[PDB]
C-alpha cells in the first residue's frame, strides 16, 4: 500500500526551471489519482489520449512526472502538436503523447517583489528540440557566421534568459507550475495500477 510520490511532485517546495525541467520516474507503487481532483480547478487540467474520469483502474509501466514553472500565457504550448518557445527550445511533447498536463498558478509561492530570476528558459537554439530531450549546456548561441569565441557580442547571445517573476504580473505572465504526467505502455508488468 505504498502510495506513489505525487505529493513529492505537486507539493515540492521549489520547482525546477523549464530548460532542465525536473523529471521524476514513478513506478512500483499505488498510483493515487484518487486525490488529484478535490484540489478544485488549478488553472488547466487536460489529459491527452486518456480521460481524467478513467484515471483509477488502468495500469501504467512508468509515470514520468515532469515538473517545471512557466508563465500563464505560454502553458498553452504544453500540448501535443504545438509550436512555441517551450516546444521548440525547452520542452517538446510528441504528436502521439498520451498523458496529462496539470497547470496551476503559483504567484504566491514563485514570485518576489524584487523579481524571482531563478527561473530560466532557452530563448535561442540552432534547431528545435525532439520530444523528451533536455539540453542544459549553456554554450553561446551563434547567430551569424562569424565565430563567437564563447563571449557575448554581435550575433552572439547567451541562450538562457530569465522569467523574473513578480507578484504583480498578469495572469498570462504569472508563475504557473506545470506537471506533465507521461504514461508509457510497453511489454512490461506495469506495476502502477492502483485499486
Amino acid at each position, epitope marked *: 500500500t505504498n502510495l506513489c510520490p505525487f505529493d513529492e511532485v505537486f507539493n515540492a517546495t521549489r520547482f525546477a526551471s523549464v530548460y532542465a525541467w525536473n523529471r521524476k520516474r514513478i513506478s512500483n507503487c499505488v498510483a493515487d489519482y484518487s486525490v488529484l*481532483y478535490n484540489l478544485a480547478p488549478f488553472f488547466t487540467f*487536460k489529459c491527452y*489520449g486518456v*480521460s*481524467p*474520469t*478513467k484515471l483509477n483502474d488502468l495500469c501504467f509501466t512508468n509515470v514520468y512526472a515532469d515538473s517545471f514553472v512557466i508563465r500563464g500565457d505560454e502553458v498553452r504550448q504544453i500540448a501535443p502538436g504545438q509550436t512555441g518557445n517551450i516546444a521548440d527550445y525547452n520542452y517538446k511533447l510528441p*504528436d502521439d503523447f498520451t498523458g496529462c498536463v496539470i497547470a496551476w498558478n503559483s504567484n504566491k509561492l514563485d514570485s518576489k517583489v524584487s523579481g524571482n530570476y531563478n527561473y530560466l528558459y532557452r530563448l535561442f537554439r540552432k534547431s528545435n528540440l525532439k520530444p523528451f530531450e533536455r539540453d542544459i549546456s549553456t554554450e553561446i548561441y551563434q547567430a551569424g557566421n562569424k565565430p563567437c569565441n564563447g563571449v557575448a557580442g554581435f550575433n552572439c547571445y547567451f541562450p538562457l534568459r530569465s522569467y523574473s517573476f513578480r507578484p504583480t504580473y498578469g495572469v498570462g505572465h504569472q508563475p504557473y507550475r506545470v506537471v506533465v504526467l507521461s504514461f508509457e505502455l510497453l511489454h512490461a508488468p506495469a506495476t502502477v495500477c492502483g485499486p
Partner: antibody, heavy 118, light 108 residues
C-alpha cells in the same frame, strides 16, 4: 437501459434552474455521466462531466457557472445552472460514457429537454 | 481547443447507394474519433468508436477508417431511415470534447 431528462422550461435571464436525469438498466456507480447541449447552427457541445470519484469538469466558458452532481443511492444526475445568459438556450442531454481501453465514447444519451431564456 | 470540421455540409443520395463523409481535425489526434447519428426529433446515437470499431447492435453497413487528421465514415448501402445528421467527435483531448459541425444525409 434508458435515460430520462427533466427540468426544462422558460426562465428569466440571470436566473437558476435544476435539470435532472434518471438512469435505468445499468449500474450508476460505474458510469461517468455527461451533460451535452445542442443549439441550431453551433451543433452539439459538451457542457459537463462527472466521474466516479467526485470529480467535475466544465469548459472554460461554463466553469464557475454550472454545477454537476450525482446521487448513486437515487441513481440520478443533477445540473445546477446559474447566471443564465442568452446563449444557454439549448436542448440538453444526459450521457453515459464508457471506455474501451484508451478510447472514450458516449454510449447512450437520453431524450433531451429544451431550455429557453427571454 | 481542437476545432473540428466535416464535409460535405449537405449531401443527397439514393437508397442502396454507397456514401462516404469525411472529417478533419485542426491537429493530429490519432485514432481517437467517434461517429454519432442524430435523426430529427431524436437524440444522437453512437455509431462508431475509436474511428475503426463497430458499436454493439449497430448494423455492419456502417464503417469507419482513417487516422491522424483525415477520417472517413462509409455506408455501403443506404437505407431510407439513414436521412439524419452525422457528427464526428474527437476523444483525444479531454475533458473538453468537441463535435463536428454535422453533415446532413438525405434520401433521393
Amino acid at each position: 437501459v434508458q435515460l430520462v431528462e427533466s427540468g426544462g422550461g422558460l426562465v428569466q435571464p440571470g436566473g437558476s434552474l435544476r435539470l435532472s436525469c434518471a438512469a435505468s438498466g445499468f449500474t450508476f456507480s460505474s458510469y461517468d455521466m455527461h451533460w451535452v447541449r445542442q443549439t441550431t447552427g453551433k451543433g452539439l457541445e459538451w457542457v459537463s462531466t462527472i466521474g466516479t470519484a467526485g470529480d467535475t469538469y466544465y469548459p472554460d466558458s461554463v466553469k464557475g457557472r454550472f454545477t454537476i452532481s450525482r446521487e448513486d443511492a437515487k441513481n440520478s444526475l443533477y445540473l445546477q445552472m446559474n447566471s443564465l445568459r442568452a446563449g444557454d438556450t439549448a436542448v440538453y442531454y444526459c450521457a453515459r460514457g464508457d471506455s474501451s481501453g484508451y478510447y472514450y465514447y458516449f454510449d447512450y444519451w437520453g431524450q433531451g429537454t429544451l431550455l429557453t431564456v427571454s | 481547443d481542437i476545432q473540428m470540421t466535416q464535409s460535405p455540409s449537405s449531401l443527397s443520395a439514393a437508397v442502396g447507394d454507397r456514401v462516404t463523409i469525411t472529417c478533419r481535425a485542426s491537429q493530429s489526434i490519432g485514432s481517437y474519433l467517434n461517429w454519432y447519428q442524430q435523426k430529427p426529433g431524436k437524440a444522437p446515437k453512437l455509431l462508431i468508436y475509436a474511428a475503426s470499431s463497430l458499436q454493439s447492435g449497430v448494423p455492419s453497413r456502417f464503417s469507419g477508417s482513417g487516422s491522424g487528421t483525415d477520417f472517413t465514415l462509409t455506408i455501403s448501402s443506404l437505407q431510407p431511415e439513414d436521412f439524419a445528421i452525422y457528427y464526428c467527435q474527437q476523444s483525444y483531448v479531454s475533458p473538453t470534447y468537441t463535435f463536428g459541425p454535422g453533415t446532413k444525409v438525405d434520401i433521393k
